[PDB]
């Protein structure tokens, strides 16, 4: 059965100390497997963006890793999913201390 994507649960707010590593991961479902997009500031995040951002997608999980976090990394990140049957989105506000 064709089913639109669903983001399972995502924290509303997360924090990290400047200079450290942040990992936020998130499960999802959808048939067919959805296309995953992470963005901040309305711009898609690409793997090895700034030499520090990494994205690991599987068929039911996405993991965003930010290495050596900088102050300017802070902001409202959106995870979006799409497939032929619909879309979903959820936000997480990433705070850099401090």
């Amino acid at each position: 059965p064709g089913i639109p994507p669903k983001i399972e649960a995502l924290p509303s707010d997360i924090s990290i100390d400047e200079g450290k590593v942040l990992t936020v991961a998130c499960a999802f479902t959808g048939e067919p497997t959805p296309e995953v997009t992470w963005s901040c500031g309305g711009r898609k995040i690409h793997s090895q963006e700034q030499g520090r951002f990494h994205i690991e997608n599987t068929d039911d999980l996405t993991t965003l890793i930010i290495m050596d976090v900088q102050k300017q990394d802070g902001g409202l990140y959106t995870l979006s999913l799409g497939n032929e049957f619909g879309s979903d989105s959820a936000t997480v506000n990433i705070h850099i201390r401090s």
């Binding site: 924290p11 997360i14 590593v21 990992t23």
Partner: protein, 96 residues
């Protein structure tokens, strides 16, 4: 030098009948072994007679002895060590 927290096993959502035991399960790695804390609605949870946090090495659980409709919602697992932090949220759905 160490390495930041990560999930070997991610906490998947649980769907449980009111009155049944429910457990969110994950496995968290990292060096040093991360301290894992669960919160709900932005508030850190306290162990009790009906809510426990079975921890066995990397194995971590949030255990509800007998789920009630009021237990439904999103729970956040936050793991921390010297190198960084990892976050994972999971939903409990409680059916009549």
């Amino acid at each position: 030098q160490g390495s930041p927290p990560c999930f070997l096993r991610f906490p998947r959502p649980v769907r449980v009948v009111s009155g049944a035991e429910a457990e969110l399960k994950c496995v968290v790695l990292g060096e040093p072994p991360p301290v894992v804390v669960w919160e709900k609605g932005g508030q850190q949870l306290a162990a009790s007679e009906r809510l426990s946090f079975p921890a066995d090495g990397a194995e971590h659980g949030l255990l509800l002895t007998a789920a009630l409709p009021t237990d439904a919602g999103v729970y956040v697992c936050r793991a921390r060590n010297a190198a960084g932090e990892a976050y994972a949220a999971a939903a409990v759905t409680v059916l009549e």
